[PDB]
DNA sequence: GCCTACCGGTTCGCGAACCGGTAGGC
DNA sequence: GCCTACCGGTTCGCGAACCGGTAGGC
């Protein structure tokens, strides 16, 4: 990391290292019980203490010049033992009772609607924005790089929770994870207590942060880097970053009809909060997603189907193509366990784009997802490995596009008929779910941008 | 836990918030936590205990609102009692119970500055390290638990995490750590203990457990 | 969270005094 | 042969000063 302003000598002398270890820590504490959730950040430029409760103008510094260089490690690593419990060399830590402990820091040529997709989906204050409602803390999460291993305990401890509340675990259990995950993700609850993890939907609400918030330093990777040289234009850097060849497909084109017939037909009759409306169709090819899907290409069953996102993740769906959750993350929110989800019905899909009236649009896709031989359920059931000859699931629903009128489409099956009743109804899903368990089943054909006529 | 505070002068240091004079040792003073702007954590704000009705706060039952006032002298809290404001079976049992509560009150007081009459520090510290007791951060807090000590018994440690358990209020609270992260939430009225064991140097001994001193347990508010 | 007045425990500084060696007087 | 006024040097006694660990304050 880099030097803190608090200071205010940061652009004046450097943040010290000695061959390898930084010297430089920034501690957390908390304790759900008491309300206590503070932060302490030490650094050694001059020795720099910072200390208070995160997110909030409560808290004090101390900026001190050392008498010499050798004395600065002998106040660094004492004040570090006296907060943290530990000496500054460790095999692996361990926290102790009431110390704090310490979290691991790392002229454009184009179209006027492809501007505006970029414009879009690298609008990285929009995804601040959207971190807000989390709780999230808002000052140093930026230029903070939270790390990999840390958010994958992070993962683990929801994991853990879920785990604790569906067996009905004791409360210094809940206690202990609620209090390990705020410590290990600063929270900024202001001056009221953070709240216990005991809900099934909180730990499936932490974690779709922790989905989210890993898309924006995602975004941020794109974004930063490259080769800065005066010839390409700052639209087209970021362009070339996304690794896609994204086309705008005409308003007069024949296959442009079918997809808004797609949207037009396939809204359901429950989801009446909102009312669709095409501002665009982008003809989306990834790099090399032709490539690894080939082999599915000889797979039977093909269909065109809905996947609905965040207009925050898309900077990564584009890079990265779309992918499974990790093992360490929980499985809570899923209904058939970890996997690509799709949707025959544009509705379904569209509420996962999270769009509201003072931000109306939003992206929405259509990828030819190989199903193949399909494993069918009826209830909610977290399924680890498929049955044998099974290359995706499906969760019936109540209502079903219509199967006889089934347009295809360049060889691949679209279901653009309207909702009629399925031939079974002892489910308890009120529309269809496509499930696939490999990141080469799906090929994203199609990305549209959707404005949402809501009434209020 | 609770916003107000009272209890004896911990050190004749501290300024009075009102009037901002130096609040005397030994001297029944009241607080206010407050949230502090330099660090994340409650402060009190120490007032003269005659200033701290003049600002404007009435605390309407100050036993279940103040802390500290069970550790308080029977006469101090009447004080705090009354300024705060500005059936046979039944009643026996009741007034019989405040007539017990006053006999333990003080007689845990007048074995506190008895104490402190006769023995220092290091030897009221080395009395709780001989019955295997964890020795407490504070001149008033070590004879506090001392007292408890030699009148009911030597606490025996935590069911499950082994740690120090303590009188506070109206109960024996759990003071050790179930984990690293999370500290224990032990709660109990009537907690495990054997007796107390004081060592043979003590010629003072006869005479201060000559004060009357039988077996009995401890006895906790309404 | 950090600052600092307070506590006990040891050291330090300096003048009184103790003391032995001595050289001028008778 | 004593006595004794004078001087250098060691000891002794006691209050000032020093100091690290900490309970209380904000
Ligand atoms: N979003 C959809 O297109 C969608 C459409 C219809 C049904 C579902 C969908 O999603 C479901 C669940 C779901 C959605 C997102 C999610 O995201 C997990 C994190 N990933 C986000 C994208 O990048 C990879 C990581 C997990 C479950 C569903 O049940
Ligand atoms: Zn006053
Ligand atoms: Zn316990």
Known sequence: ?456 | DKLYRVEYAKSGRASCKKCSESIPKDSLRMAIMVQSPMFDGKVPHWYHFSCFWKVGHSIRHPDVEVDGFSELRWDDQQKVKKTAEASKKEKDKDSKLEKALKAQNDLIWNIKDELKKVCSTNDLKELLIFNKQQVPSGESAILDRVADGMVFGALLPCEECSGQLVFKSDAYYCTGDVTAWTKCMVKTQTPNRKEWVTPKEFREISYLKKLKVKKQDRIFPP
């Open chain 1, 1 to 456: 990391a880099a030097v803190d302003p608090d200071s205010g000598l940061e652009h004046s002398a450097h943040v010290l290292e000695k061959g390898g270890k930084v010297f430089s820590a920034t501690l957390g504490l908390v304790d759900i019980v008491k309300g206590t959730n503070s932060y302490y950040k030490l650094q050694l430029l001059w020795i720099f203490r910072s200390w208070g409760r995160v997110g909030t103008v409560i808290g004090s510094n101390k900026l001190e010049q050392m008498p010499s260089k050798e004395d600065a490690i002998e106040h660094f690593m004492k004040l570090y033992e006296e907060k943290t419990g530990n000496a500054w060399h460790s095999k692996n830590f361990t926290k102790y009772p009431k110390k704090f402990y310490p979290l691991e820091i790392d002229k454009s040529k184009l179209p006027k609607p492809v501007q505006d997709l970029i414009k879009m989906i690298f609008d990285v204050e929009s995804m601040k924005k959207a971190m807000v409602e989390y709780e999230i803390d808002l000052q140093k999460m930026p230029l903070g790089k939270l790390s990999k291993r840390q958010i994958q305990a992070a993962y683990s401890i929801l994991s853990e929770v879920q785990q604790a509340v569906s067996q009905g675990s004791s409360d210094s259990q809940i206690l202990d994870l609620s209090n390990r995950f705020y410590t290990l993700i600063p929270h900024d609850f202001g001056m009221k207590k953070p709240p216990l993890l005991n809900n099934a939907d909180s730990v499936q609400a932490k974690v779709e942060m922790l989905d989210n918030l890993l898309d924006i330093e995602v975004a941020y990777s794109l974004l930063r880097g490259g080769s800065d040289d005066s010839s390409k234009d700052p639209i087209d850097v970021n362009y070339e970053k996304l690794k896609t060849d994204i086309k705008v497909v005409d308003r007069d084109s024949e296959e442009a009809e079918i997809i808004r017939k797609y949207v037009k037909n396939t809204h359901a009759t429950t989801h009446n909060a909102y009312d669709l409306e095409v501002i665009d169709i982008f003809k989306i090819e990834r790099e090399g997603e032709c490539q690894r899907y080939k082999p599915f290409k000889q797979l039977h069953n093909r269909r065109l189907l809905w996947h609905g996102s965040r207009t925050t993740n898309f900077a990564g769906i584009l890079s990265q193509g779309l992918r499974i959750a990790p093992p360490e993350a929980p499985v809570t929110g899923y209904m058939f366990g970890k996997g690509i989800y799709f949707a025959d019905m544009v509705s379904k899909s569209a509420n996962y784009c999270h769009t509201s009236q003072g931000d109306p649009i939003g992206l929405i896709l259509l990828g030819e997802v190989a199903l193949g031989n399909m494993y069918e359920l009826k209830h909610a059931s977290h399924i680890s490995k498929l049955p044998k000859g099974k290359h995706s699931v499906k969760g019936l629903g109540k209502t079903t596009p219509d199967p006889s009128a089934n347009i295809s489409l360049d060889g691949v099956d679209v279901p653009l008929g309207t909702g009629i009743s399925s031939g079974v109804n002892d489910t308890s899903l009120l529309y269809n779910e496509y499930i696939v368990y490999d990141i080469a089943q799906v090929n994203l054909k199609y990305l549209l941008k959707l404005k949402f006529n809501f009434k209020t």
